[PDB]
Design a protein around this ligand. Structure first.
Ligand SMILES: O=c1[nH]cnc2cc3nc(NCCN4CCOCC4)[nH]c3cc12
Ligand SMILES: O=c1[nH]cnc2cc3nc(NCCN4CCOCC4)[nH]c3cc12
Ligand SMILES: [Zn+2]
Ligand SMILES: [Zn+2]
Lengths: 364, 364
């Protein structure tokens, strides 16, 4: 019923658990968003994505704005109808992948081989029918000089204001969707503070920590999160973009993050990597050829209820589509079970113990 | 409950409809068997294969005997457990693909780059836990001289007797599975008769028409079926190997065939060809880019209940796994709906009219 309502039900240290209520559904936080690259979570029907426990998916905009195109998807009834996912979708701005997959940069926006600006990005996300819209920003490369990081962040803040204005100008979008801003500033505490101040001044429904998971490594990422997350408004969701491995997620939650997206469970799945409570395994390895156990001994997913490591080993080695399907369903389910354990442990005031127990076993 | 019981419930001309009862399930005839190439019906979970209406699948033996190997599959609990399909499986002998995918031929069997003989084939199928076992034969190439066809057929008949003996020697196989013989003789009526006589003398649970769908074309295939099928025992199932397109199936049923297998619905599915009552379409074609209709307007499958041509067009053009999944599920469901319409129309004594109506619309 509500457009966007974030409620925090429980806390432990910097960690929070709660819910975001939106018109298309409730999102339990901390949340993991499976990534839909070109209007599909690779190798999964939407009903299967939901069966794993996902409340919301991320829709990449960059590919969709090229093919089939945002106007075409709108003509076909919007992204939800098009792909058959009726729950919330968070769309990215399209700019991150422009820089990584295409470019000419200016104050207006980015030209690439088309022009993408804050205004055009917001309109594209509107045409897709996004529930959570990301402001159009610039992900500062790493490493960056303080001066380069500063000028980059400042441009992102101007683009954040333009994103806000474009979103607010579209009545139907403002009434039915939410808008998140993205903090920049590289690894520099003062710039992160200036960025947080600028975003709070403008005002958003949620705040992402941008500019991380770009090669800096976990120690440095955690160091930056240590000071950066407390700068954001406490009463709104905190979203860490493009993170990450299970241990990255646990540590980020310990530091105040409420939302995550990553291609790892899907991409790894197709490549033969399965996540387990005892760490990742490569199912192609010969040691699994006669292993009748499920991928993970505790996992509640449909794959682990029915098929053996030996069978999935065979499928992946044979290049069979079903191999990709089963690995992906399991990995996404594993990620959702991780999030559920995180939510329950915070709710119960035993998250610290969970984090310690998780790491001891995962890295044994 | 029974090992193998074929009952004919209704007839119209040469067409029959009925059931084969086996320990793992009932098979409604005329039946279409989706093909499982390497212990998977490509891009489908077994539950989805069943949801389309399939009563039985065909398991290719050739690939499995190489990897993971028949002894390994037996150690892992058999093919049914391995792949998660608990209903009947018909296994081929492995010899057809040896000739088409690998060879040295002799009276003992075939050597290839391993030796495959009637005895080894039967043992492999036993290790897999097959419900319907195919005799090991030789598919005569087309065209063939009468003398070459004759010597080839005669060798197949000797191999059929050896297959029978090997099957009967394995108590557990003889008690729980069925054995089909394969008629040869190329396009020659006298040789087809000699082959049928030899097979009936030995005695099988079912009889396949071999040596067809090997380049002869539909007119010639139908011509050979016209005289060949009546030579087989009327009271046992008739199985046409490797057929075929929807119109091939309808015409073969008109000529007395009860069982079919073909890679077309699965293989075509992955390649972008969808079967419809108005003929096949290629979903990649630009004309489908904004088409909100389902693949077929009447189809009862889950794919046609939920997704548009436009979406599947997008998926297939993007090389997305979900595209292969949806196309394959629809095509297999379409084939099963065809078989259901065939069964109902024969039961109701209106199959002739159905065949005419089907062809008029399919080829309009
Ligand atoms: O500042 C950002 N602004 C807008 N989008 C982003 C997306 C981002 N994605 C990553 N990292 C992705 C890490 N992946 C891990 C798996 O393999 C692919 C890379 N960092 C990101 C930062 C930003
Ligand atoms: O005498 C036979 N003996 C044992 N196995 C067979 C398998 C057979 N498979 C075909 N034809 C297959 C036709 N396919 C159509 C679809 O594209 C691939 C070929 N004909 C066949 C004949 C025999
Ligand atoms: Zn699992
Ligand atoms: Zn359909």
């Amino acid at each position: 019923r509500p457009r966007f309502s974030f409620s925090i039900a429980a806390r432990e240290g910097k960690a929070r658990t709660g819910t975001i209520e939106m018109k298309r559904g409730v999102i339990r936080t901390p949340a993991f968003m499976p990534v839909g690259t070109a209007a599909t979570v690779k190798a999964l029907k939407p009903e299967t994505v939901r069966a794993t426990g996902a409340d919301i998916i991320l829709g990449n905009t960059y590919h969709l704005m090229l093919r089939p195109g945002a106007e075409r998807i709108a003509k076909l009834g919007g992204l939800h109808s098009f792909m058959g996912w009726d729950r919330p979708i968070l769309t990215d701005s399209g700019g991150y992948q422009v820089m990584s997959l295409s470019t000419k940069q200016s104050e207006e926006g980015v030209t690439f081989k088309h022009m993408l600006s804050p205004e055009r990005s917001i309109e594209i996300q509107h045409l897709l029918g996004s529930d959570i819209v990301m402001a159009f920003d610039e992900c500062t490369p790493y490493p960056a000089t303080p001066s380069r990081a500063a000028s980059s962040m400042e441009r992102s803040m101007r683009w954040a204001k333009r994103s806000r204005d474009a979103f607010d100008s579209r009545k139907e979008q403002a009434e039915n969707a939410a808008l998140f801003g993205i903090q920049q500033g590289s690894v520099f505490e003062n710039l992160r503070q200036q960025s947080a101040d600028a975003l709070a001044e403008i005002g958003f429904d949620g705040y992402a920590v941008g500019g991380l998971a770009v090669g800096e490594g976990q120690d440095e990422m955690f160091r930056v999160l240590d000071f950066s997350v407390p700068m954001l408004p406490d009463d709104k969701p905190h979203y860490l973009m493009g993170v990450g491995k299970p241990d990255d997620i646990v540590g980020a939650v310990e530091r105040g993050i409420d939302m995550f997206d990553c291609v790892l469970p899907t991409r790894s799945g197709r490549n033969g990597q399965a996540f387990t409570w005892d760490g990742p395994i490569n199912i192609r390895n010969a040691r699994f050829s006669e292993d009748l156990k499920p991928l993970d001994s505790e996992c509640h997913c449909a794959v682990c209820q029915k098929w053996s490591r030996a069978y999935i080993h065979h499928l992946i080695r044979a290049g069979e589509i079903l191999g990709a399907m089963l690995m992906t369903e399991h990995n996404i389910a594993f990620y959702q079970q991780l999030m559920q354990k995180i939510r329950d442990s915070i709710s119960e005031g035993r998250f610290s113990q969970f984090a310690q127990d998780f790491r001891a076993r995962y890295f044994a």
